[PDB]
Amino acid sequence: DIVMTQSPLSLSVTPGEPASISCRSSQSLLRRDGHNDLEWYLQKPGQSPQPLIYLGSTRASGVPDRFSGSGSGTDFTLKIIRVEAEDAGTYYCMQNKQTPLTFGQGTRLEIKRTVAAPSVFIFPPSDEQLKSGTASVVCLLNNFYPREAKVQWKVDNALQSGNSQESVTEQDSKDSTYSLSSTLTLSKADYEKHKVYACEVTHQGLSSPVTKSFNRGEC
């Protein structure tokens, strides 16, 4: 099988600045006609891969001037002359010379933007969830940059360790930010045994960590 080695595996570029991705083929992809059996795909968050370049350098329909494929034989480059927020996603090179078709590891393009502190919201268990015999406390960290964020949970000043799960959305295609949900799982009996539910957030965009809390039974 032809091996496709992509480089780098990730990069963070500020909009308006250029981006370059390398792809090395283990075998010659050069055709008799001067082209190469090399393609470039972009996969945006929550989407299928989409063609960008084929025949090594031909732009796919609707793909703008700012995107270019170059190289020959074994060494390939995808260039984005001017990076845009919409470009956020994973880029893959692919050989279509022969079967099996083979792809590179993929390159995640992060759109670099200005540091943005999260907006923090806390949701007690719903009365309807409590009715079903279960309790989930949700802490929301909205629209922040960079993605590195830390959430600490305290229940009556007791640090919670192992009873929470986090989920981070992919980089937003428009505003270049991330969002995080942290869920604290407890039994209804434990939820009812305590008063203060606190979510502590640490992020580059906050001078000091921010705490959002509620008291069970509004107390």
Binding site: T99, S119, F121, P124, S136, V138, T169
Partner: protein, 220 residues
């Protein structure tokens, strides 16, 4: 119009079989080479196999990893391509994509169909509101949502106000809980001045268990 309908996916037990379908609309499949590519959650792209066009003797090739477990065919009378996968293992769990290599829909990929190879049974989700309150207000902005808990397998689709509400929406990736069941939250940030007047419904559909719920999220 040009379209690629994908189905035949879903939940299957280890050792089981699945027949994926790739239905073409607006163009004739017999004139195109149809490929299949998979992607495990958070992973890269892996070619599975292909079927060449009629003018290319309907020639089939398959990935070495899928060692004599695959059968690609076409029903030209139905204008559909099929990927038959036998003796499925947990590592075959992935989104499977139908890829057209031809005149129309050239190097374009279908939306894909998710294949889950697991011994766990289907479970419809519980849908709970994440009501807006003072604790979920920051300045002149309020956040609200829906907790989509305890379902299996993936996927779950969530929309707001039947697709009319999209701005400020974050449907979080599902996290697999210790129970072996998934859970996700879908949230919206809205103006707080709209809390008592505008209605916010979340439309949840877990197709694997035929669970569709329209849940109104009200303040307090």
């Amino acid at each position: 119009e040009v379209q690629l309908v994908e189905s035949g996916g879903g939940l299957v037990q280890p050792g089981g079989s699945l027949k994926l379908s790739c239905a073409a609309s607006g163009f004739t499949l017999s004139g195109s080479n149809v490929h299949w590519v998979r992607q495990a959650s958070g992973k890269g792209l892996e070619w599975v196999g292909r079927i060449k066009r009629n003018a290319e003797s309907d020639a089939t090739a398959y990935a070495a990893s899928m060692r004599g477990r695959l059968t690609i065919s076409r029903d030209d009378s139905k204008n559909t391509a099929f990927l038959q996968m036998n003796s499925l293992k947990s590592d075959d769990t992935a989104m499977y994509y139908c890829v057209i290599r031809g005149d129309v829909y050239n190097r374009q990929w279908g939306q894909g169909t998710l294949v889950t190879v697991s011994s766990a049974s289907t479970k419809g989700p519980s849908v709970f509101p994440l009501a807006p309150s003072s604790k979920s207000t920051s300045g002149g902005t309020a956040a609200l949502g829906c907790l989509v808990k305890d379902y299996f397998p993936e996927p779950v689709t969530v929309s707001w106000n039947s697709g009319a509400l999209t701005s400020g929406v974050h449907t979080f990736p599902a996290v697999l809980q210790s129970s072996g069941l998934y859970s996700l939250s879908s949230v919206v940030t809205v103006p707080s001045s709209s809390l008592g007047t505008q209605t916010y419904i979340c439309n949840v559909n877990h197709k694997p268990s035929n669970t569709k719920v329209d849940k109104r999220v009200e303040p307090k």
